[PDB]
Symmetry: D2
Subunit: 396 residues, 4 copies
Amino acid sequence: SLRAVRLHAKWDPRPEFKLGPKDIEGKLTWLGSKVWRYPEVRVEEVPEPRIEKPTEIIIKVKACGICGSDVHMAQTDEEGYILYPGLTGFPVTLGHEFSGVVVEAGPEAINRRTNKRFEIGEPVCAEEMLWCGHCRPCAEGFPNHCENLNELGFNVDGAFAEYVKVDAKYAWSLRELEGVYEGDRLFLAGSLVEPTSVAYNAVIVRGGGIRPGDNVVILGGGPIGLAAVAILKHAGASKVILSEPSEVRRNLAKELGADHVIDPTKENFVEAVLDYTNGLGAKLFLEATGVPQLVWPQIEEVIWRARGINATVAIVARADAKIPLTGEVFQVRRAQIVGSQGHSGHGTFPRVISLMASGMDMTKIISKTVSMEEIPEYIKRLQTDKSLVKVTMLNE
Amino acid sequence: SLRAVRLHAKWDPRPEFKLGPKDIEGKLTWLGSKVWRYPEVRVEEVPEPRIEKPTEIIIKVKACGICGSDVHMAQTDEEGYILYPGLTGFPVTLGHEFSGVVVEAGPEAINRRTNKRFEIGEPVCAEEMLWCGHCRPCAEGFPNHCENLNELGFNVDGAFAEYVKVDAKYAWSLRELEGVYEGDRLFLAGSLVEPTSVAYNAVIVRGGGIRPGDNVVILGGGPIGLAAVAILKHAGASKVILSEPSEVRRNLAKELGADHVIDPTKENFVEAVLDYTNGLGAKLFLEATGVPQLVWPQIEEVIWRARGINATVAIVARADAKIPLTGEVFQVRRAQIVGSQGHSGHGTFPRVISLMASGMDMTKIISKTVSMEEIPEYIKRLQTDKSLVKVTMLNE
Amino acid sequence: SLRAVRLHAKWDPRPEFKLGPKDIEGKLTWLGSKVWRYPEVRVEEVPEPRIEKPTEIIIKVKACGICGSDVHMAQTDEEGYILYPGLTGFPVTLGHEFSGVVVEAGPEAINRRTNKRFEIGEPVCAEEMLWCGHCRPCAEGFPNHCENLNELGFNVDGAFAEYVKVDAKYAWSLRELEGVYEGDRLFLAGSLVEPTSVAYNAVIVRGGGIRPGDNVVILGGGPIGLAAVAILKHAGASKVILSEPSEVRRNLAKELGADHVIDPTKENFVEAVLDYTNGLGAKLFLEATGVPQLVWPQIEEVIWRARGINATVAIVARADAKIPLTGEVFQVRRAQIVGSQGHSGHGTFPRVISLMASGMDMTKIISKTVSMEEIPEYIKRLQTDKSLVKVTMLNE
Amino acid sequence: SLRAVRLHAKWDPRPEFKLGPKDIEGKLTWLGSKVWRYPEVRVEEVPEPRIEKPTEIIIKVKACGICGSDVHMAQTDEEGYILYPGLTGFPVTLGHEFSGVVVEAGPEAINRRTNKRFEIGEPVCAEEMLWCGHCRPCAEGFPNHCENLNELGFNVDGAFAEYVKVDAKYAWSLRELEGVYEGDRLFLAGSLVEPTSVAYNAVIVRGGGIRPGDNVVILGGGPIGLAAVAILKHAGASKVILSEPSEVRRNLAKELGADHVIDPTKENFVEAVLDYTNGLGAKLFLEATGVPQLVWPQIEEVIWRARGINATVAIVARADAKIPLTGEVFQVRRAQIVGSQGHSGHGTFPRVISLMASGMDMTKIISKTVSMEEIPEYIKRLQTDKSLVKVTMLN
Ligand SMILES: [Cl-]
Ligand SMILES: [Cl-]
Ligand SMILES: [Cl-]
Ligand SMILES: [Cl-]
């Protein structure tokens, strides 16, 4: 009587593949696209989750967003290999951008909000990055770089399901959203915390944030770029400029508070940015396109010509191609480059929840809510349908 | 014949006064209240100001705010000594929270906006702290701690006048406000940059700012406290709480975006702060009351009982009394105390200006605009009339 | 049969005491000195340690330092109450400054050095703050402020024993000391990591550290002050100045790299600090006396009169009395005050270990090594014998 | 009659050169190597310097080091153009790494040591970046990015001379070295403050410094790389590793505190770095080779494979070639890249001076001291003679 969206695939590695040190033959690899072949995504029966450890909770799922990584796990190259390049342990229940209600909690399952055992009925979201808590990075406070990481919806059953079990240490209360987001809207808001927290980690934690009055430039208007728009407007950016080919995304960015939006295929990016900032340029650039080798010369030209100094370029999207870095630009303009990944640690989750509670409405980016049954359809449709910004499962 | 509001007093020191290392007999002291007696303040004739160095500009003053410092220079204790404790060189033209248009400029009088000589007609405000730019603190980037400081409206003629001369290096363009603040409102906003920058230096630079989603508590709802409300809400504070006995001030705080206001004479500050923040407390406390010895226990008790950690207390008001500091509170809650002084350096002035341009309207705090002729009267009135938040000279 | 040094006391609270929210009647309090009476320390037989969770290890103790807190747990006021004011769960095996060798490890007991299960024979030291890993402060990377804290040698059986059981996540490898420190000296050095890490957390992590060339002033030459001398010299402090009335501690400070030592009882602290620093003062002051209310005026006078700015006062010692803080001093000299506690997180332990491995030898401070049997005697003797800087249990 | 080492060159631009917005035809350009041609360096007679501003001082030069910049200003490509690519106003007296004694000071010429007028006899060094103090970068505390810069020994007469004149605000006392550095050595140490401060800015200010116990890796063992070695050893680095093809420089690095040296042409840099750090790698990498495009893939490999995280790569050498940056490496290892230039601001000069006073002896890197007359010869010789690490004029 229980059902979830699951991905099955054939372990059939490419000839260059050698089993990685943390890979498990036939079951788990750190290099998905080298190994897993002919992915199939279907709704299927699953056994009931059960509390195995005293710190575990079982959440009844209300909403779950489809990530671009979900699309890439289910999509193939010409040879039938998945596009998704990273950690994958199939078969798995997909979905990691979620919220729901706690329906069961082991005796040691603590809610950080109360520092007491999780109570039935608590609305929660959870982290996708399942950090171990004991390794050297975790012990220094850097869980996004855990040496023993697992990933919800990648190799641990996720949340395109009726129920999902996770350790309490990954769950965060949505109680603050109550009476700000009525009914289902609370859970929609909750399901956007993970991708907003990716953006938050990138611009606030790794980026170093801004002083109010600073300008920022975001490249890429997907979910992460869009969350950056809202976050940095809320952080007090005087000008928030987003560069993005897609019109629906540029329009969304305006709803989220972008002061200017650029279509880089029809406008000169460099000139628009300099004009918009009166030659000052920006304190922070967020590279969220995934084509940094293509946008990098433009970013450098702004940094070079701008009168502002101390610019940070935060790289959050994944790409393979090399970046054409001109050392001199960063020397002469007192600028720097940081990489970002993940959404865990640093109190990022709770601050994003508080920020949502205090008015920051990300639910605007949800193009469509759908039933669990329609999720396989939309996962496939997102391979080509550029009009869809964010599709969210909603259990009604 | 030009006129300005000038203050005169007698050099007649208290018995404890010994001439300071940088004091000049009869003319200048760093210990104003120990020295200056029976102050008189009036509109009087002044000679034309003039370019005397190639770096100088002359500004036709459009607006100048009365600071509590001006009130304290003209108010005496029961023995006739001025209340203002710091650097004072009388007689002087008063006024240092001001804006106007440039009407003359030396050949080396550079506008930072263009890196070119100031244009006649350029709307500007200026810093009150006249840093030297060559001492060790200045050379390290800390001009609020200049070893050879002079102060506009304290020992150098100021801006309650028709015209004021200042070095171009102190002046900042208000061009960004054009077509956002129309007419006199541009100069009213310009005149609020200095006090707003004192707040900004205290909460962003010294206090270290906040991450969006943090809570903040401001104690004292004078101009500095009110600026801090607006600045920290603009920086994305989830809850901004202001504590101030005065109702007019609390209501203005709401208008500037404070989420909760506390009258500490009628309500329990500690319980209200804890109840408003759901037991989390705040990342930042601004002590802007000047009675730190009275509010310190309440601050400490919040920090102690609050579950939030890493709280910073920023001390911006000048008080003479010992603060009853409990070390253990700061050790156990991982908290710290920073002092703050002034408004110069760190690109505060230009950020405050861009922030106002982007929507942060501080002009809401202006209780009254008056003519130059009325300024002595209002400086007197402000000794007792606590309903007036900010009174501003407006040259029409 | 195994033996250990255990403290027994009577649950007999002062009239003012009310049971704390986390206290357990008859067993555990957060307020030791308000509750525990007539303490007695004895070597007694103990049950064999057991791996009960798969993450635990058992360590054969080689060395354990007597802390001042150990002395204070077994010392009483006139009415028989213990002097130690903090968390205490009696009876308990004392000892928390220790090293030894792994003799057993559970299946999931991971050594951070290798990211593999601990090997039998691995030399280790361990943290005393037993942080939970899951509360909000832990999840934000601040484990010294853990909401569910236990404490080794306070309410969890400690290391004045032949064997001690701890979770693997508190243990740190001493491999790097092999061939630098021969035989027992390796374990002696290991036993000093905890107090050295308290100093390290106080001056590097909380204090913010220094830039090479900065001056530092340390008040108090107990083991914490002595570690700070060593750390801050290794950190590139141009001048390290220690103030301590005990001659033996001043000579130890010189041995650890202090450039100047001050006997405050026979010398003028303020003038001596100002003379030695050529009027510059210091970037960092470490208050490690426990009498911050006696030394504060002198610290404030140096900060005030010094030409340097941006001084930090870090408070590490526990004191009860209020500090007479003059806000103005901190405002005018751009100075700050941070509290510090604990030694966990931030990678402090392993960096302290690497530092020792590269030449920083703290074993110079060990006055005497003694057998387990002699420990109760020395805990008593340390109440009055000030010649003993550090006394360490050595098992052979 | 006074003399100084001066460089004369011809204004004769490359065809692709257009006069820059701040250039002065025949006199000053921001692009030296696009304009100046057939440089000649000679000792010649100069007028006596004169206090022209109340804030100026006049310094009797005691020591001046030759910078790689002086070499590239007097070195040419095959078509006769200077190798130096930046701001140059010729003719000029060369030399900008100097110390000496104040012999005349204007009425407003304040010594930061005293906050009073400089007095005759004060040993000083001075900054080379003549920052304006008033532009927005200067106003914000960032004078290495001054919008109105002048440069001593580039377009303002420098210190390969018996005397040099500078604004008091660029000058820093060497009082603290008295008693520690005996005789001429005080002035040798002073002359090394500017290049040492370049390294300090790069590793402490821009690089963010380190926590004691951290490891560091320096690539390039020129004067900047070698100062970084001493600075970071003094900062408490548990392992200081320097990679450098030159044997003389590797040997100097060990004298300066390096725990390990690597010859990358005869050893595997990646494997050596991981071995010496027991797989943990480094907190900070200083790219001071000027060939970042050749060493970069090796840095990325150490960072990728090391178990340490939060690594910073600080790029201080000037190069032209693009860097093959792999973004994924910095994302997955939580690492970052910072650029650095200059030596001004942030209290770096006075800290470097205090550091030298407390025991950091940079004077070891001086290969040879020469008289003013031999400077032009050594400026030429340094084009080819790689065994000379640092050559210093001693008056
Ligand atoms: Cl992290
Ligand atoms: Cl400052
Ligand atoms: Cl902590
Ligand atoms: Cl700079």
